[PDB]
């Protein structure tokens, strides 16, 4: 199987531990599990890839703990404590504790946990000072294969715990795309410097080269910024700065952060359309969050300032409509049957699609006949997640078009 398949399988297994009365919290916490494991890139999957049995149940115990959750986001402080205990719920900790203490900045434990590894490794070998330096370097080079975090804390010349100024640690954490490191050193910055460093990190990561590991850092820094209006104005000065922020947040299911940012000409016409398709793409990737994803779509769709954006998004031209994929994926979600949703929810989804279709007919009535054919061809030519095989989804669009014409 592919590496992405293995991560998705591990994610679904770990998501079995997410239980809560509010079904919106369950969905939000499940997406947090996916980010922890990793989606397009390995995150913590490297440390858990072989876990089975009680080793999985150990992680289940940590993720069932309410103390490890801050809303729908993971409490990194609590995780660092749990991942460095010897035992939780009667089950021994299957994780390499020095690695976990490095990742979660449990600085009180980094050095003594490393000594135990250093001594056990040294004792297996068949000047006493220069040899110990060689063993220490051999151990650090071995562990760092899993990331720069695993040699960040241990001085190679002395073996002592490295001491960083908060600014240097913050910059290094952003460079490493080290989400937990950003949060740690941010708490040690001067209160005078906090707003500036958050801005620097947001501008640095909001670029066309961004990856999914930038999204947790962008989410953390945005939610700590007090003056979001000045941040957006500065971010709008960078090429694709606002797009990269919104896009990565959307694809990692940080819907609440995007919602607050939208409520508060900063992006182009194409950026607006990519927001819609990214939101609807994520909708099919995470069906338990389709309600929140749809509410973010309708927010972009109902902004008065974006009246021109929404008009051009339904303007059929050159045998294509910019939003033909968005309509297609909304129909796929409306007809999804792999998750449970009441007939009231399915009726609300149908109405959303009908209102958006009526806006396309009202804006360009001479083009609406071609518009209907392009949406049908999109539903018939492109396979998508959550779309049942051997089913003509174009007929689902034709049913909607007939109801609109009555």
């Amino acid at each position: 199987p592919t590496q992405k398949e293995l991560r998705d399988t591990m994610s679904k297994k770990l998501q079995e531990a997410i239980k809560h009365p509010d079904p919106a919290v369950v969905a939000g916490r499940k997406s947090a599990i996916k980010r922890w494991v990793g989606v397009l890139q390995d995150n913590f999957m490297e440390h858990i890839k072989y876990f089975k049995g009680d080793k999985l149940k150990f992680l289940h115990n940590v993720f069932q703990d309410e103390g490890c959750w801050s809303g729908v986001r993971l409490d990194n402080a609590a995780l660092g404590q749990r991942f460095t205990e010897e035992k939780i719920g009667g089950i021994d900790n299957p994780l390499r504790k020095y690695e976990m203490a490095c990742s979660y900045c449990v600085v009180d434990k980094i050095h003594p946990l490393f000594q135990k590894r250093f001594e056990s490794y040294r004792n297996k070998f068949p000047t006493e000072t220069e040899f110990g330096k060689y063993v220490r370097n051999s151990l650090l080079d071995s562990i760092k294969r899993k990331g720069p975090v695993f040699d960040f804390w241990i001085d190679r010349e002395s073996g002592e715990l490295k001491k960083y100024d908060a600014v240097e640690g913050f910059d290094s954490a952003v460079k490493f795309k080290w989400s937990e490191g950003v949060e740690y050193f941010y708490n040690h910055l001067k209160e005078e410097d906090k707003e500036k460093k958050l801005t620097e990190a947001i501008l640095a990561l909001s670029r066309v080269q961004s990856v999914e590991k930038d999204a947790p850092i962008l989410d953390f820094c945005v939610n700590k910024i007090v003056d979001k209006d000045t941040l957006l104005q500065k971010l709008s000065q960078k090429d694709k700065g606002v797009y990269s922020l919104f896009a990565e947040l959307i694809e990692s299911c940080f819907f609440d952060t995007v919602h607050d940012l939208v409520q508060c000409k900063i992006f182009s016409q194409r950026d607006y359309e990519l927001f819609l398709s990214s939101l609807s793409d994520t909708m099919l990737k995470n069906p338990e969050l389709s309600v929140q994803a749809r509410s973010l779509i309708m927010e972009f769709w109902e902004c008065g300032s974006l009246y021109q954006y929404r008009k051009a998004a339904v303007n059929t031209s050159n045998y294509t409509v910019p939003t033909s994929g968005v309509f297609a994926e909304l129909i796929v979600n409306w007809r999804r049957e792999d998750i449970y949703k009441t007939d009231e929810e399915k009726e609300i989804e149908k109405k959303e699609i009908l209102d958006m279709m009526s806006f396309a007919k009202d804006c360009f009535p001479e083009k609406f006949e071609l518009f209907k054919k392009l949406i049908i061809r999109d539903l018939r030519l492109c396979g998508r997640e959550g779309k049942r095989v051997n089913v003509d989804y174009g007929l689902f669009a034709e049913e909607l078009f007939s109801e609109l014409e009555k």
């Binding site: 592919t2 071995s142 896009a247 990519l274 793409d281 033909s324």
Partner: protein
Amino acid sequence: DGLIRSLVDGDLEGFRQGFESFLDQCPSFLYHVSAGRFLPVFFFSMFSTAHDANILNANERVYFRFDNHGVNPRNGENRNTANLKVAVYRDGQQVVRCYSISDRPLRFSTRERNALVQEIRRQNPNLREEDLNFEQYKVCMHTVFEVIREKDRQGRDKFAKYSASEVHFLRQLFRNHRLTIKEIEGRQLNQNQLRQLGRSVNFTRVEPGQQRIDNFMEMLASNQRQDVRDSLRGDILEYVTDTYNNYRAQIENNIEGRSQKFESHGFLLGFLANFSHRYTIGVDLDLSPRNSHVAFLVRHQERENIPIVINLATRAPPYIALNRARSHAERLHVFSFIPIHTESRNTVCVGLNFNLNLDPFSVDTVGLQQDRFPLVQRLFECLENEGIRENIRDFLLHHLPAEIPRNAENYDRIFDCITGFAFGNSAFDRHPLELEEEDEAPITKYIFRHGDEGLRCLTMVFHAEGSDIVILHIRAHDAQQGAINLQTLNVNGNDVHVWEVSCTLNNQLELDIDLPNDLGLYHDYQNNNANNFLAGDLVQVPNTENVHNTLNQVVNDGWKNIAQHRGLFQEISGALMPLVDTINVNSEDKFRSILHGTFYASDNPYKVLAMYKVGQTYSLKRGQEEEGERVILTRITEQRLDLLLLRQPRDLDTHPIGYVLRLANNAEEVGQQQNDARQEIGRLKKQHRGFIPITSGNEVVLFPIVFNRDAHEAGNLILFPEGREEHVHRLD
């Protein structure tokens, strides 16, 4: 101007240069010009999409037919190859330009002329037959491609007697595939047969759509992965499938056994070629058996473009083809040069099947996977894990050079590459074993020298100090072979287990790894097999930390320092000299694979590539024009680097290092081989366009490396140049 534009305007030099530039972009295009109708469908795709790309105007009428070869007169079996007959005529003109395209140095026949005139006069009834003057061109490819304008002929000599399809028809009509052209010309046809022969030859008009594709590559050259994904989902792939279906009849008619695989890829490539003059579109094909992959990168001139990985399936459902595209894209750092040309971490994957009416394609995004496979680590954890054993199998097979055939004639080449690469990886890996129980362990390595001098079997022993022992075997299919004596190992422990992992390269040239067997405790393994010990010596691998230290300086600051390179190979020789009689370096493949695995297993450099094609050279030959005849011949010779080392960009200079290798039988042959290698470096100095997309710098380092199989000391094992410095090649 574009390829089709220059070709339609009769600009033969412009087309030749334009097509030479496309062959740079698609370095494997020449390997497939004879696979079915790959080449005819390629040029048909270019013509059938030229109008939508605004290359040809509406008043330029295009007429085409597939002149299918049909029955082979040699043995009577049908062929799936053909010629492409294409003609272009502008409305207010008198010149009709006819193009014959095939993979053999064919002309328009008389009946093809008449059918074409019939079709042209239908579109413009204002013409008399004597108004149409015919210019005849040819494009043929077989390391040589030629563009030809035929002589100005008169009378009936202007056109051939029969097309390829006419010969097939008449051979079927006469029930004798053996008839030659002369024998067929001697037989009489009745009125009905002549009329049938007229119907068998007819051209189809290329009828464009209303959709413009001018700015399609603008969307694929975007630095935003969502832009590349959505443009493929709702625009580009729909156009490609629709255009293919609109001509499905002409493609599927009057041919049996057509290679739907190679014809699908040709059609896709022809679509991309119509943009090769406006963008830099590197295309990496992998059409080897059981592989139908196309990966390409659209650049304006940049290093942040999104790779696109397409899997063209012919009978598999869309989701299956997408998974193969996903699987291929994850290992793209191994299979392709595309990750060399971009720093993008994600790729867009496409599963495509033209033969489907419902969901012919589906798109997804997938992240590039790092190619840092730790062979020794994975060996210890594969003992009870079939999945990791499959990963190990793929690690050895997927690093083979792609241009080495996997047939019975190249068994020894394949076997030398696998053993050499596995040896280089495992013998030079400096890291300890990471144990399951939150622990590490130093690994002492060994290699066994069997008593039989001709036994094709690589045997290695890995002893994790304080942990288990793993014996690794990589045997040939005929390696009929007791137990390996392990008394020299310093083992003090009543809990050490001896494991055995055997790998075999069978007659089918597929790597089969057996079930790892636990041979018992160490002392029990030694108490038993007392009379079962194989003849041979277990040599311990020397310490290799000096290799990694010197290799770190070569890749980075000592990039252009000749002494730094010399010190690297002195350390490599010093590590290999105790093992020369055991590792048995008897081929240039074995020597290259050892260095390949040695560089791979080290943390420096970032990437190491074996047999990396950097480009091609073109030698032109022009015939003097005689009565309107023009002939331009282009001979193509490839340039491959045996090894290429690259640094991780940050300063974006990747410090490219190239090693040209030679194998010497004794110390006297070293001089000839070193001189021979410096000549190959001379030809590599002419290549510039292939070095630009791999680095932001302006220089590349090339060295000649010679292995001496008769060396008695490490100082004479690997020879390094001791005149004017000739290892820095400056790019323009």
